[PDB]
Design a protein around this nucleic acid. Structure first.
Ligand SMILES: [Mg+2]
Lengths: 97, 98, 114, 805, 44, 46, 88, 53
RNA sequence: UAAGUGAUCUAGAAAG
RNA sequence: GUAUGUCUAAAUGCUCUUAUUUACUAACAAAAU
């Protein structure tokens, strides 16, 4: 399990995380992938967390896309990615509450 | 093992003496030694040295040696192949020279 | 606390099978482990030119690549891999495949061998 | 330093004054005339055995690489060249010839120096393309010499007789000299030994060239001289070697020998040399003479140069001795009597048996040495007193001592000996050839230099082995040990220092393996794991350590006289497990020589019989005396003999290999193809297992029973499929690198896990391994990993639960 | 540590036994009215 | 040390991998041969 | 065998690198060898070496040297201040 | 004033530069040669004479 | 007439 | 010796697969008869 990722997703760590989730309510919304279809999330806190995560992602995307080699295609691709992120964020701002 | 786990004959002899086997088995030991000697490709001083050491050590060992010798020329000599026989003879000569 | 550590501490209630099951349940949800292009450190055997900016990355030069499994195996039961690299100057994704028929590699829309 | 020396030489002419050089040349010419030497011509195109010679050279070249698996670029290139040559012999030969003719400028010789920890040696790496040519030259020239009798009987390293054998022969000769041990009329025998110091390092090329011109084709000579005269490189410094022969380049050995011949001639004088040789039409064999009177006449009796370390046996009468002494005194006055002080005596031997310092005997030796020195100019070769040794046999000195080839020999005539005690082991009973009496004794001891070398080798093996697969290390150790023991079989027993070193070296080796396993707890490695062969999963070492070493009164040991009393421990705690010792499976040198003498005679007789009856002598009839002799009888009837008959001057070449290669052969002294396997150690292998209880006992140490097999019969490791067709990706691997299984130590640990990890531990903090019931008494490294692998995915629990179910 | 063409060889005088294990562990699956899929193991 | 890739699984120039590949080929090759002969026979019959 | 462009490149490298750093230079010229490269440099490339011919006196001297240091040719070259092969 | 030296072993910056990178021998070297060649000649002529004899 | 008594080093953990 | 750095506003149970590993790490060390 060299290079840290393996360590992170080693069974023991996972178990610990699960335990934390069970007792006290420590989740790491960084750690899990954000769900595709909203309205399968009855809790508000979770939703908020997800929204926050997406915002963070968007910010990250923004930070990188103004790099100096602007003509490279990665940046262009991200522009679409950025849009997608924005859309997701908007969706997360649903009007149930 | 003792015979073969020993640099000089002297060491081997010492090892043998450590064992302190009964006056019964001395002859047997001698026979074994002889056999070992025969097995080696040509006559080694080692075995002779060992024999000498044994002989000096005690009268019973001398007696045993004598017995072995008697056995050889009488009943065990004709069994051996030539090189082995020659080796044996050489060993005996060495023993008997002094 | 020391790299050659014999036994990692477990809680007093740790049903190992159960734990494993739990992990599995929370592996589909997991971000890492449920993805492709897992990282790797590799030297470059081909010694090739980055097709965009013509940067001549030579033999044995070390990179933090991404190894990914190619689903279409060679023959039947011997896998082949895509091994992504970046050129030092321009950030173009070079990669290569390991087709073991010739005991060597194949370039994959990254650069050219020379 | 070398380049400074060169510069100095350039500045102030050669050390050799021209007149002296001229004189030497004249002497050489005279010698040649006496011998009626046909000079060696330049190789013709349609020379008879040219192709064969080339092939031999190629083979030799291959033998540098055929062993090693790794090859650098240069090595690869060389290999390729060799292959090409093999393919296209005629072309290659032509090319070589052309090179010889024309090429007087050469590529620069880069030098590494090797760490023989006592004293570093140089290694001259010549360019692959020229190297082949050089090899060819070496092959050819030596062959020519052999044919034509360039080198006389006395220059022995060149001869096909093995160093120990040579030594034995020398001893015999010394015993067989007539009236040699008599001390009634004061017949003082002086044995002088010494190195010809810097003999390679102070050859002038011009003089050398001239000398060559006498014996080889002038073109060839020129080629040789230019070749020696190269740009030596090292890292960033480089210098033109303007003076002194380079040892490494292949033919150099021959050149060296030739040079040494001149020195020998100078030492002797002409007439004496001629006498030694014999007549040209039928020359003498080594140390034989056509008559006794002739032998008697001169003061010198026996000569032999060995590789620039000459041995002269002078046999004086009393009157002769006195005169010499007087002369010495005249030369160098001695009122305070400081001739015994600053006199090279042999510290290895003890004060009684070493050369006694009598004011006659000591002086005589010194005088002799002085005379010898006078005989050669210092400029041609440096014969120093610090290098030299003079033993003197007399009425007062009964021990003719000398060090040859790595042996220290003490020839002690039994008429001088007090009580003619039982022949020990180590002693060669020297025999009179006429009467067949064991007339003298000769005690042996491995010379301290050899011991030092051995130690260095051991160190090397140990160092640069933090990785290595335990087994590889073990193998290396075995090789080292085998070299040591096969070289001096008989002569080990006597030397206690060597024994001690062996004990220590072996222990060190063991600890290396134990270092890998991060412990060295003496219980956790019972001799089982080391000496058990690889065919039961062990390292398969070949011990010489479990010997009960001779201890003695160190008070009275170095001093005076000795006897074998009080044995010291030897190497380890044992469970009364007498591990056999390699020495008892090696036939002591005297015995071997006697055997050789017998079976060669027998062979001859057989041949004669065949001739009488008109038949080709079958190899099935000689079976019985098949693996017996020197060379081993079996050297006649191997299926590749015709070509090796043309490989003459091979031993010398092998010896000189040291200067060409980085890691050399540890069995330089012998050579399998010309000699046959001088030892065999399968018996030892067989017996080690027995010593270690039998197979069952060994298994019980191992995890063998845990595999759940009925019995150890028809089990092996790393079997796999056949793998040869797609095996040309490797390089000089010889299809498969090793038939022997390597036993990677990860698995080794597992195999011996049930001994290595065990309850009877001294201080191991008993941790229970993770998710299993497998106690580890201390952190043992690979073992734990293996255990985890075995018991992966909660296997223990599964097992238990399964059982319950 | 380690220890089509040949069809006519099956019917020589030496005794043999084909052994199949395909129908040893057999199951039947069925939905109840509630919805639960009952994987019932059967006699094999 | 020098060439890193030599201590990787994925590296085909690693010897173990090569061996495995050979084995795969050998088995598969054998199978093909077995089938190939049959095919030939069939053709002949036809 | 040495091509001229390659030689030029080598020369350039030497000015860039260092007449005692023959690995990098070798690498730079894909076909030619490290130890060979240095040799080549010694032979042709270095300006201080007088590869060009010289007067009759010099020739005479060279011949004299040849007579009196039997084909000890590197030494002769050194004495001259000339390269070896050319001298030969 | 002291120059700016350039190493034949090191170039930190890699800054290239336009190639900034006794004859008498002792009596012996002639004398020795004379001795040798002359000796050789003597040997030759002497040898010839011997042959004739 | 007298052999064969005793001398017994060690010993693992981290980081590199 | 398993490098490192920037980046951070405050669906539920179910079972079935194994005589393996898309395993990762190379800082560590490098020879023959
Ligand atoms: Mg460090």
């Amino acid at each position: 399990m060299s290079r840290n990722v393996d360590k992170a997703n080693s069974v023991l760590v996972r178990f610990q995380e699960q335990q934390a989730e069970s007792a006290g309510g420590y989740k790491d919304y960084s750690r899990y992938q954000r769900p595709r279809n909203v309205s399968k999330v009855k809790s508000i806190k979770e939703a908020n967390e997800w929204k926050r995560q997406v915002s963070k992602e968007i910010k990250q995307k923004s930070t990188r896309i103004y790099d100096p080699s602007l003509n490279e295609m990665q940046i262009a691709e991200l522009n679409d990615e950025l849009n997608n992120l924005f859309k997701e964020w908007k969706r997360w701002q649903w009007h149930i509450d | 093992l003792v015979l073969k786990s020993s640099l000089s004959g002297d060491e081997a002899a010492h090892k043998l003496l450590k064992l302190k086997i009964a006056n019964n088995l001395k002859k047997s030991v001698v026979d074994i030694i002889i056999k070992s000697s025969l097995q080696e490709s040509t006559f080694s001083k080692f075995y002779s040295i060992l024999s000498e050491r044994m002989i000096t050590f005690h009268r019973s060992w001398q007696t045993a040696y004598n017995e072995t010798f008697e056995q050889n020329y009488t009943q065990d000599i004709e069994d051996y192949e030539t090189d082995q026989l020659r080796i044996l003879g050489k060993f005996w000569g060495h023993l008997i020279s002094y | 606390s020391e790299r050659k550590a014999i036994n990692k501490y477990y809680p007093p209630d740790y049903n190992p099978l159960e734990a494993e099951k739990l992990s599995r349940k929370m592996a589909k949800k997991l971000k890492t482990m449920n993805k492709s292009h897992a990282s790797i450190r590799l030297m470059t055997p081909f010694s090739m030119r980055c097709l965009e900016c013509n940067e001549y990355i030579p033999k044995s030069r070390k990179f933090n690549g991404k190894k990914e499994l190619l689903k279409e195996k060679y023959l039947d039961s011997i896998k082949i891999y895509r091994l992504t690299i970046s050129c030092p100057r321009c950030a173009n994704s070079i990669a290569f495949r390991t087709d073991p028929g010739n005991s060597d590699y194949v370039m994959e829309v990254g650069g050219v061998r020379n | 330093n070398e380049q400074e020396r060169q510069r100095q030489i350039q500045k102030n002419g050669p050390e050799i004054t021209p007149e002296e050089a001229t004189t030497i040349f004249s002497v050489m010419v005279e010698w040649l005339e006496s011998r009626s030497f046909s000079p060696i011509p330049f190789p013709p195109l349609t020379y008879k055995n040219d192709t064969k010679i080339l092939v031999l050279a190629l083979e030799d070249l291959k033998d540098v690489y055929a062993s090693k698996v790794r090859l650098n670029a240069s090595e690869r290139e060389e290999l390729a060249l060799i292959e090409e040559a093999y393919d296209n012999p005629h072309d290659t030969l032509n090319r070589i010839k052309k090179y010889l003719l024309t090429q007087r400028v050469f590529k620069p010789v880069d030098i590494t120096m090797m760490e023989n920890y006592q004293n570093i040696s140089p290694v001259y790496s010549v360019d692959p393309l020229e190297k082949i040519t050089d090899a060819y030259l070496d092959q050819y020239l030596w062959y020519e010499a052999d044919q034509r009798k360039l080198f006389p009987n006395w220059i022995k390293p060149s001869d096909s007789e093995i160093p120990p054998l040579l030594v034995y022969k020398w001893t015999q000769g010394i015993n067989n000299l007539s009236e040699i041990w008599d001390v009634s009329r004061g017949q003082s025998a002086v044995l002088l030994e010494t190195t010809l110091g810097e003999m390679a390092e102070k050859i002038d090329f011009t003089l050398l060239n001239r000398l060559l011109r006498l014996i080889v084709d002038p073109n060839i000579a020129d080629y040789i001289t230019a070749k020696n005269n190269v740009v030596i490189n090292f890292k960033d410094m480089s210098h033109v070697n303007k003076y002194g022969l380079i040892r490494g380049l292949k033919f150099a050995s021959f050149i060296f020998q030739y040079y040494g011949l001149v020195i020998d001639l100078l030492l002797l004088g002409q007439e004496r040399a001629t006498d030694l040789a014999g007549p040209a039409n039928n020359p003498n064999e080594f140390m034989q003479f056509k008559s006794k009177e002739v032998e008697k006449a001169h003061p010198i009796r026996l000569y032999t140069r060995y590789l620039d370390r000459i041995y002269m046996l002078f046999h004086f009468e009393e009157d002769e001795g006195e005169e010499l002494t007087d002369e010495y005194l005249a030369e160098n006055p001695d009122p305070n009597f400081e001739n015994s002080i600053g006199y090279n005596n042999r510290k290895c031997w003890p004060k009684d048996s070493r050369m006694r310092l009598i004011r006659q005997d000591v002086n005589l030796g010194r005088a002799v040495f002085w005379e010898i020195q006078s005989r050669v100019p210092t400029s041609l070769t440096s014969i120093k007193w610090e290098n030299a040794f003079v033993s003197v046999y007399s009425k007062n000195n009964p021990n003719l001592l000398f060090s040859m080839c790595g042996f220290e020999v003490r020839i002690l005539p039994r008429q001088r000996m007090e009580e003619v005690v039982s022949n020990d082991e180590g002693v060669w009973d020297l025999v009179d050839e006429r009467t067949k009496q064991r007339t003298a004794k000769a005690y042996l001891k491995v010379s301290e230099e050899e011991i030092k070398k051995f130690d260095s080798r051991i160190r090397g093996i140990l160092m640069a082995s933090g990785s290595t697969t335990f087994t590889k290390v073990a193998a290396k150790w075995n090789t080292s040990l085998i070299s040591l023991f096969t070289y001096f079989r008989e002569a080990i027993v006597a030397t206690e220092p060597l024994l001690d070193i062996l004990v220590k070296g072996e222990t060190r080796i063991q600890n290396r393996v134990k270092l890998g396993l991060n412990s060295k707890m003496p219980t956790r490695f019972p001799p089982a794991v080391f000496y058990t062969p690889k065919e039961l999963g062990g390292l398969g070492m070949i011990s010489a350590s479990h010997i009960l070493i001779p201890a003695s009164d160190l008070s009275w040991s170095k001093q005076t006289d000795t006897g074998i009393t009080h044995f010291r421990a030897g190497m380890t705690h044992e469970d009364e497990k007498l591990i056999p010792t390699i020495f008892r499976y090696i036939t002591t040198w005297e015995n071997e020589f006697l055997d050789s003498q017998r079976v060669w005679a027998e062979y001859a007789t057989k041949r004669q019989e065949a001739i009488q009856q008109n038949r080709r002598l079958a190899f099935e009839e000689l079976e019985g005396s098949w693996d017996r002799g020197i060379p081993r009888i079996s050297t006649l009837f191997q299926r590749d003999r015709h070509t090796l008959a043309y490989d003459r001057g091979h031993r010398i070449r092998r010896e000189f290999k040291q200067y060409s290669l980085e890691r050399n052969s540890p069995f330089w002294w012998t050579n399998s193809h010309h000699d046959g396997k001088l030892w065999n150690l399968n018996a030892y292998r067989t017996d080690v297992i027995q010593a270690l209880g039998g197979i069952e006992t060994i298994l019980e140490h191992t995890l063998f029973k845990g595999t759940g097999f009925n019995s150890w019969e028809g089990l092996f490791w790393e079997k796999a499929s056949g793998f040869e067709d797609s095996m040309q990706f490797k390089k000089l691997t010889h299809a498969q690198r090793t038939g022997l299984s390597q036993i990677p130590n990860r698995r080794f640990t597992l195999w011996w896990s049930p001994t290595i990890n065990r309850a009877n531990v001294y201080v191991g903090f008993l941790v229970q391994l993770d998710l299993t019931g497998i106690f580890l008494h201390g952190k043992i490294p690979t073992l734990k990993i293996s255990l985890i692998q075995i018991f992966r995915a909660h296997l223990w629990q599964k097992i238990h639960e399964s059982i319950v179910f | 540590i380690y220890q089509s063409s040949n069809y006519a060889e099956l019917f020589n005088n030496d005794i043999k036994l084909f052994v199949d294990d395909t129908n040893v562990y057999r199951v039947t699956v069925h939905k109840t009215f509630e919805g639960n899929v009952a994987t019932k193991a059967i006699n094999g | 040390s020098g060439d890193l890739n030599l201590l990787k699984s994925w590296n085909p120039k690693l010897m173990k991998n090569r061996k495995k590949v050979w084995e795969t080929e050998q088995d598969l090759i054998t199978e093909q041969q077995k089938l190939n002969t049959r095919l030939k026979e069939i053709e002949k019959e036809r | 065998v040495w091509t001229n462009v390659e030689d030029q490149i080598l020369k350039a490298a030497v000015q860039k690198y260092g007449t005692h750093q023959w690995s990098k230079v070798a690498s730079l010229l894909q076909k030619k060898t490290a130890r060979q490269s240095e040799l080549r440099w010694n032979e042709y490339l270095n300006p201080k070496l007088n590869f060009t011919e010289f007067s009759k006196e010099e020739d005479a001297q060279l011949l004299d040297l040849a007579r009196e240091l039997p084909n000890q040719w590197r030494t002769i070259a050194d004495m001259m201040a000339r390269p070896a092969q050319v001298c030969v | 004033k002291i120059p700016a030296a350039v190493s034949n072993w090191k170039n930190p910056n890699g800054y290239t530069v336009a190639l900034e990178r006794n004859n008498t021998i002792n009596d012996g070297f002639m004398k020795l040669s004379e001795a040798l060649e002359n000796a050789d000649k003597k040997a030759r002529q002497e040898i010839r004479s011997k042959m004739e004899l």
